[PDB]
Design a protein around this ligand. Structure first.
Ligand SMILES: CC[C@@H]1C[C@]2(C)C=C(C)[C@H](C)C[C@]23NC(=O)C(=C3O)C(=O)[C@]2(C)[C@@H](CC[C@H]3[C@H]2CCC[C@@H]3O)C[C@H]1O
Ligand SMILES: CC[C@@H]1C[C@]2(C)C=C(C)[C@H](C)C[C@]23NC(=O)C(=C3O)C(=O)[C@]2(C)[C@@H](CC[C@H]3[C@H]2CCC[C@@H]3O)C[C@H]1O
Lengths: 181, 181
């Protein structure tokens, strides 16, 4: 399968940015968010307690295995179809996510609506979000809504973080975290 | 209803930033996202079609009328309680929102979990999001998930945008859009 050059070279694009402004969110923080949103946490509870109530997928990497862009003039409504693979820190494949995106806006920041279904050994979950692709190029983290569907994830919901993690790779790798409750 | 000095002076804080990087969304884009998320629209239709399917609140201004901070040592888990006013472009009051936030992370970017309920003339809706406050000071737009509660908004869902709009005010003014379907 093929990967559009814009995805292959996205890491290189990041390296040309003059704004290099990381702002990660750790999984404990993401678990507090997930538990608060699920009404299963109180902000006089302790963060490690939120983490204990959650299903946690961290120290995950993802990158594109297939990415096709269907361009429209001016870029508005351009569509993307992708399959990405999840790997652990050691490079072991854990699963895939199959999704599509729609370009909402190009300038000054490119924004995309993303929706995907992730399939791992122990179940599946959906991710949906409105993400600032220019902010990601400038190293920022973006957050998507996660809804569990099958297996271990069923009936649970939470959040996912996405950020570029190694811009020297082609295609680049992204750091991914998922917390559900 | 008093307003914590950090909220009063946040516009001045924004003006001290050296990264000034706005990236807004137009409502049509936001309507495309809302309609895609709700399964009422197809990537292959045209954007103005999505706009007609939606309830649209564009060009809103908001600012705090009350804001109380309950600080926690280290900044993480600090809570915020606020009441804000909505105005249209000409300055007519449309309603209010009362919200609660929790600081998730302080550095290198401050992140907050927000949840709020907006009360307008034709009903109420809830907004929930995980937002990068540092990105906001640097002029970026943040997106929250919206769920209608009552009236016209009931049974509808979509998105809200938030960005600083006049940092010269005390407290500063924000631009808001809400689109539901
Ligand atoms: C920063 C946001 C993007 C990261 C994603 C979300 C991360 C991951 C893990 C998956 C694989 C998708 C992502 N990877 C991509 O390469 C693209 C993605 O949406 C695109 O849409 C590109 C290929 C990328 C760049 C430019 C293209 C855009 C297609 C539409 C026209 C643009 O000129 C945008 C990416 O950097
Ligand atoms: C997303 C950026 C924030 C804008 C909000 C979301 C916008 C609006 C319209 C409503 C009214 C709330 C907001 N306004 C604020 O002043 C605060 C808010 O969360 C705070 O939390 C402050 C008072 C602000 C600054 C510093 C404080 C923080 C409280 C916690 C300790 C921080 O040191 C952060 C704001 O820039």
């Amino acid at each position: 399968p093929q990967i559009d050059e814009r995805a292959m070279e996205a890491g290189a694009a990041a390296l040309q940015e003059t704004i290099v402004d990381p702002g990660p969110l750790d999984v404990t923080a993401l678990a507090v968010a997930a538990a608060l949103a699920a009404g299963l946490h109180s902000a006089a509870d302790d963060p490690a307690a939120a983490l204990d109530k959650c299903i946690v997928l961290d120290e995950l990497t993802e990158f594109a295995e297939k990415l096709v862009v269907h361009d429209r003039p001016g870029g508005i409504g351009t569509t993307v179809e992708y399959v990405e693979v999840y790997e652990d820190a050691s490079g072991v494949r854990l699963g895939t996510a199959t999704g599509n995106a729609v370009v909402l806006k190009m300038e000054p920041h490119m924004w995309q609506f993303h929706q995907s279904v992730s399939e791992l050994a122990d179940g599946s979950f959906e991710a949906v979000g409105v993400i600032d692709c220019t902010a990601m190029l400038r190293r920022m983290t973006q957050v998507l809504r996660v809804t569990g569907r099958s297996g271990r994830y069923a009936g649970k919901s939470g959040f996912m973080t996405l950020a570029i993690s190694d811009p020297n790779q082609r295609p680049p790798h992204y750091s991914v975290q998922v917390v559900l409750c």
